[PDB]
Design a protein around this ligand. Structure first.
Ligand SMILES: Nc1ncnc2c1ncn2[C@@H]1O[C@H](COP(=O)(O)OP(=O)(O)OC[C@H]2NC[C@H](O)[C@@H]2O)[C@@H](O)[C@H]1O
Length: 265
């Protein structure tokens, strides 16, 4: 936790100073790209996403979200979109406290926090709502510079990705007070809106994963099935993306989140 906390603090300083020093000694400017990402950040309310809905190579890997994004970005020039497994309540989750989860890693490694911290309406809505289902609100963050690898090392050459920030329902907090089918409907509606936003913004290649299946305690078979219904068997997004990677990095024994996605896809 202490090493992650230190890295998080360094990233915040970097975003303030607008440059960082790579291991070679190269000083890398990022202010322009960060400012662009912030200025282009958009909050989508549920009903706007619903409007977007009125209008493929599939891989499962043990990659982190960022490792998959970096691989895809090196292979072609079209900007990749990545799903941020978001906190409903804090931009970048607990990254500044040294918390260890997917969003926190994104926030330690990129300009994502500068984008999300600029959308207080998203977080205020959920704070007032006080409901663990959260909502279909989504933050779209274009061209966010990514400048660390999985180990926290600064990159000689940063790359840019779009992020889609949407919180999965906190099934852990809900317990058995909603049915499997109710949660499935919430997941399907929300995932459809994530995909609609990605497509709306011209992203043909996506990095998805075990959304909500860690701290939020969702069932990875159900989350994998949710994406499958949308992307496969003549679903609404079948054939609409060029490349979808389910990058599932699961350090628990048996890597069960990854196993569930591998089984389905
Ligand atoms: N970096 C990364 N890449 C890919 N997959 C990952 C990664 N880190 C974890 N995982 C896998 O994805 C699963 C879900 O990750 P998690 O970050 O726990 O997402 P949640 O939606 O359940 O939790 C979110 C909340 N945690 C941090 C945020 O601030 C949100 O509060 C997790 O169980 C792992 O199997």
């Amino acid at each position: 936790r202490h090493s992650r906390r230190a890295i998080a603090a360094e990233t915040v300083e970097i975003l303030e100073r607008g440059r960082y020093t790579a291991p070679s000694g190269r000083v890398v400017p990022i202010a322009d790209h960060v400012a662009q990402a912030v200025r282009g950040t958009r909050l989508y309310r549920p009903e706007k996403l619903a409007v977007l809905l009125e209008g493929t190579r599939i891989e499962v890997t043990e990659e982190t979200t960022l490792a998959a994004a970096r691989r895809l970005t090196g292979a072609a020039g079209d900007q990749v979109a990545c799903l941020n497994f978001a906190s409903a309540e804090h931009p970048g989750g607990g990254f500044l406290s040294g918390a260890h989860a997917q969003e926190e890693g994104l926030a330690r490694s990129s300009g994502l926090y500068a984008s999300l911290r600029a959308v207080p309406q998203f977080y205020a809505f959920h704070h007032r709502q006080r409901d663990p289902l959260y909502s279909d609100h989504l933050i779209y963050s274009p061209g966010v510079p990514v400048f660390r690898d999985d180990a926290g090392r600064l990159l000689e050459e940063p790359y840019r990705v779009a992020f889609l920030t949407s919180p999965a329902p906190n099934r852990r907090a809900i317990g058995d007070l909603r049915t499997v089918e109710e949660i499935g409907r919430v997941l399907r509606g929300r995932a459809a809106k994530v995909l609609a936003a990605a497509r709306h913004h011209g992203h043909r290649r996506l990095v998805l994963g075990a959304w909500g299946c860690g701290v939020f305690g969702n069932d990875p078979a159900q989350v994998a099935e949710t994406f499958a219904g949308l992307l496969l068997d003549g679903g609404p997004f079948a054939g609409r993306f060029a490349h979808v990677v389910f990058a599932v990095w699961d350090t628990a024994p048996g890597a069960p989140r990854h196993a569930a996605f591998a089984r389905r896809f």
